[PDB]
Amino acid sequence: WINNSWKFNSEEPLITKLILSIRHQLPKEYSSELLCPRKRKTVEANIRDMLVDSVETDTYPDKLPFKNGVLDLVDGMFYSGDDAKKYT
Amino acid sequence: WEPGFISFEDAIKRVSKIFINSIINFNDLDENNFTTVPLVIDYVTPCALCKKRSHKHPHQLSLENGAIRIYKTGNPHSCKVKIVPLDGNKLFNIAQRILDTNSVLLTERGDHIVWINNSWKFNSEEPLITKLILSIRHQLPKEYSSELLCPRKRKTVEANIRDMLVDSVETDTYPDKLPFKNGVLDLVDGMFYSGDDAKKYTCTVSTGFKFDDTKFVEDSPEMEELMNIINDIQPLTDENKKNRELYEKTLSSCLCGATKGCLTFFFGETATGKSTTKRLLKSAIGDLFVETGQTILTDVLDKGPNPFIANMHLKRSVFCSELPDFACSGSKKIRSDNIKKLTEPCVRNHATIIIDTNYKPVFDRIDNALMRRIAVVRFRTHLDGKIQNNRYRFAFLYLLVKWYKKYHIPIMKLYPTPEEIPDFAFYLKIGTLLVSSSVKHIPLMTDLSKKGYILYDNVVTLPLTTFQQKISKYFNSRLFGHDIESFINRHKKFANVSDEYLQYIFIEDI
Amino acid sequence: VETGQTILTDVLDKGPNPFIANMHLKRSVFCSELPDFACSGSKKIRSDNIKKLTEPCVRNHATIIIDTNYKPVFD
Amino acid sequence: WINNSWKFNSEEPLITKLILSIRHQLPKEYSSELLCPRKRKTVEANIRDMLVDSVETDTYPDKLPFKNGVLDLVDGMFYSGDDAKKYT
16 A cells, blocks of 8 residues: 555565655654665565465445545545545 | 754664663753753763763763764763764665656556666666666765675665655657657757756657757758759649648658557659658658558458567558559458557557558458548659768758648648548448438338338338349449449348348438 | 457457456446448357356456447347 | 687676686786685676677678688788777
């Protein structure tokens, strides 16, 4: 989930890009640790080892996706940014 | 405090970790008063710096050469001095500085485009980012240059750079640019960019030769000698106005990079100056111009991997044929199945197709869809080594650019010409003579009853004999037998074994 | 996505069709604007292809609408 | 360019052999460190990065190449050894 969208790739990984982009939200003493690619690879390995349960994508049939958000057909409300993260 | 340094509170944290003994006034230091306020150390344990019990004078810190120096006031020699560097991961700063120049970009397809030697270079197997890192050492500050010599550090910077490109851009967007080996030229403004000024336009192709402004002048003996042939083939006469307009419009569409599939026909007698333009096209555009024959027309593009189809991408103009028609007996006729896909924007295609032929050909398959793909311009009125020597390289660029700036400004629209499309005049005439049955013709039974019309499946129908007797009076079978024989079987409907009907009514009755 | 009668005429199983692989998650696909097929010289509709379109597995979510001036003829 | 001849190679590395052969021509202090394979690989990695421009081979149409040199036809002299290096 980068740039307010879900991205899919099988050859160029994006977990390292996500780790690089998350630095600001982490506590300050944690941010400076992610500048070295070796540490980013270690964190990526930990994350990969820590995912064991799978989830299904494109489940809700009554949602209208958009470049900057999603639209609810039933209620006519627009959800943008983090509010659209739940709908995969 | 400088942005190149590590963050302030991190420096305070490491300074705290130096001193085992707890600090009393640790919260009173900010980014503006650290060098002034002396540090108050509650020496529960002996001084961590020099192991003596307590100091008569408090310690103090200062920032010299991007490093925090820990020293004791009063007599500094009674306590040992520590140094704490403040620079953070110099390689990341180098990656920041390199990326700020917009020299490397993501091409949206999974590769990377690198700006080296005044060009954008594609590559999929050999690394080009490292070459860029080695080349940009001079633009970077002095202290950053020495690190970029070790291959391991260059690999680290490449790894850092690869992780900060999360946005994709599209290449070859502007369709009004002429690429060149040493820059890019603008059609609408007639000025040449070179070097870094051309970096904003992401052109991945070039004509293969440099641009010379010395030859590009208003008047020269060479262009004066050339313009005579062009003026002779099409004289500037009032009766030759629409033909000259079509001729000017069809040539100057080659420079435009718009995606379009409207074909044009060069019809005229042989050895009438038509053949002179084919060499000037190659001498003008150069690499982007590619000549080919009818092999594309005949061979099926879908069947098998066609290298020509894979390699025609990013080609401004493609000359369809160079040899006279094979429309006579013993050769494969013109098939329209291949001409449908070349008009579509995606196969991405960018070529302009022009066919020159001395005689009108015949099409095996025909419908109404061909009006949007066929246009013709005809010649009415009436050495080789010089062109190969690139003698007239600019004399034809000037003609094309002057035509483009004269008329090719508003839009790239080619009006098709049905004036003399072969084996189409009879079909166009019969289009206005035959109309299909519809709801609007149903309430006309008062007028159609005398014609013998019968309503089958709520459709007005006509047997073949009446159409044949009412259609043979207008034309002789001797000259138009082919079209009528090929058309009869196309639109025959059988109500039963014995009933054959056509759902078409000639308008001349009303 | 808009397309024509080629998918209707051609059998999807015969040969590799990239478009059939790329139809995945396409909400609406306009099928064709084809004219009458009762006229001579036009191949009839292959009824094998329409059977698998209804099946959920090719995931599919496309809605197919066929626009014709007059009624065609099946085989 | 090894043994007075230009050679292609697509699978086996030839740059390392070139370095080992050129070892003698370098200054004396530089001859010792070329014996370690790791240093030779580092030098190869360095030299692969400074070649950004490309050249074309077999461009002169009036030469007869030989095993021990190249013969010029328009005038009639033989170039052997280093003299034939300029003609690819």
